[PDB]
Amino acid sequence: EIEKLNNLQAVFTDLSSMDLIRPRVSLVCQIVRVGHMELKEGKKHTCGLRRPFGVAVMDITDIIHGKVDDEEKQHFIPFQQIAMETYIRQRQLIMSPLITSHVIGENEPLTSVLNKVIAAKEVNHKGQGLWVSLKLLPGDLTQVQKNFSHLVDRSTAIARKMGFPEIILPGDVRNDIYVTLIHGEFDKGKKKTPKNVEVTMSVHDEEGKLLEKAIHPGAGYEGISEYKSVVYYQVKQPCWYETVKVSIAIEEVTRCHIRFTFRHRSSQETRDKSERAFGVAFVKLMNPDGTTLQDGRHDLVVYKGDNKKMEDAKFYLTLPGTKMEMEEKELQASKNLVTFTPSKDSTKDSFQIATLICSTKLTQNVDLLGLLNWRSNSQNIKHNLKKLMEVDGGEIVKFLQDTLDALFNIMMEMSDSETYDFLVFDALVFIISLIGDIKFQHFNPVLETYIYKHFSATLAYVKLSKVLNFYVANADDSSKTELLFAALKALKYLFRFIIQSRVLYLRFYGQSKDGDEFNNSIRQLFLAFNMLMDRPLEEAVKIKGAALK
């Protein structure tokens, strides 16, 4: 692109304070040639196909540390090519030729070349490489584009960190579904040469319509309908590890899936286009329980058989897309012997992907939605409430407001059961404890936003006072000790919610017919703290300390 050579500026924002202080950081440029499979002249070869060339690595840890910051410096990153050493040394081997081997000069994945370049401090570039002026600019994208507009303008290419910052700004609307094609074992089958498998993954809706521009090869590049994986010249297990950008709208991603098509790519264009993708994978970005695809590894399964059937969104989507999916279907078919015949089409071919979902609304947990489905998951509310605290506060904070409202509504409808009251209480205590953390402090304003605006309780304060009074009356308990202690640590917003419920009661009933009862609750809480404290110090020294706190 002629309009990019003088505009090729790369910026990597979202580097948290933890990102810089990492011991070893390297800017790794992956160089992949696109075109002919074989550098041979005389016959037509399939063009437009991506082949591995080499990896260029420098330890920019000191550069990201800010140790050397100078615009005139052009740090030359040496380029290391894949070892295509099969022509120079082959000319001198006499008096004992006993060799039965092959040429491996392009089939190594870029992962191993990158590993070698990382290990080898000196890169035998031999005059091949690139120049990049590397600098660290403090602040976020706005500050870097405003404090360093000359350095970083709006046209400057922007790339984000593969992860999450130390500060989650409330409303960081992002759907960075980073799909990485780790590996896939594809059967050679009838073809003696291993198939030049390509992961032509494709984003289709539940109707199967391919969603164009959904897949982005990387930063600074527009999206594409389908992304092609790197060609490996007859590898049984082509290892790609290719990180791409998948930008699906969080509202439409609920009905969006990526269909991973793998085609055998013979050395000739006629055979290449005459060979259809022998096997296709796919994954729903949704768990069956109404939650989006989880963060981590997922092992896709390559199916075989009719090509029309395997492209039928009403058929292949119904088929288990992952190994865990086949295991789940088999186990559930083990308890029901009702029309469950496993198909021989389940070949041993499988595919592996990694999906780091950097999203703000996408939800990945079953217990969370079970509580969010409490009105119809009443049978598991006791289980869901216990199993909430295992869920990280990061997943909670996406819908903390609705979680609070659901807990309060659970209190509204079925307050008779005090055990669920205790479960909700302890879960909320954990909520406040985690939001008070530096990671989650920024959503405390959002928490207050819910309190002052979206809080929807009118008597929950009564029950909270009851339960907390039970805590303080049962202060000496060891099992309660941490609970009451964390309640102390969370008293502020606890009573903010209590008083909000009380004032909503007042404004929904005009005058408190139980204002005497409410203030009596306050006073009896006071005398309860008196009963807590008059006990000997030694049992609860830190508890009285936190009480004073």
UniProtKB/Swiss-Prot annotation:
Residue positions, PTM Phosphoserine: S96
C2 DOCK-type domain residues: 174-358
Compartments where located: Cytoplasm; Cell membrane; Cell projection, Podosome
N6-acetyllysine modification, residue list: K549
Domain remark text: The DOCKER domain may mediate some GEF activity.
Quaternary structure, from the entry: Interacts with CRK and CRKL. Interacts (via N-terminus) with tensin TNS3 (via N-terminus); the interaction increases DOCK5 guanine nucleotide exchange activity towards Rac. Interacts with ELMO1.
Protein task: Guanine nucleotide exchange factor (GEF) for Rho and Rac. GEF proteins activate small GTPases by exchanging bound GDP for free GTP. Along with DOCK1, mediates CRK/CRKL regulation of epithelial and endothelial cell spreading and migration on type IV collagen.
Family of this protein: Belongs to the DOCK family.
Protein name from the UniProt record: Dedicator of cytokinesis protein 5
Organism whose genome encodes this protein: Homo sapiens (Human)
Name of the gene this protein is made from: DOCK5
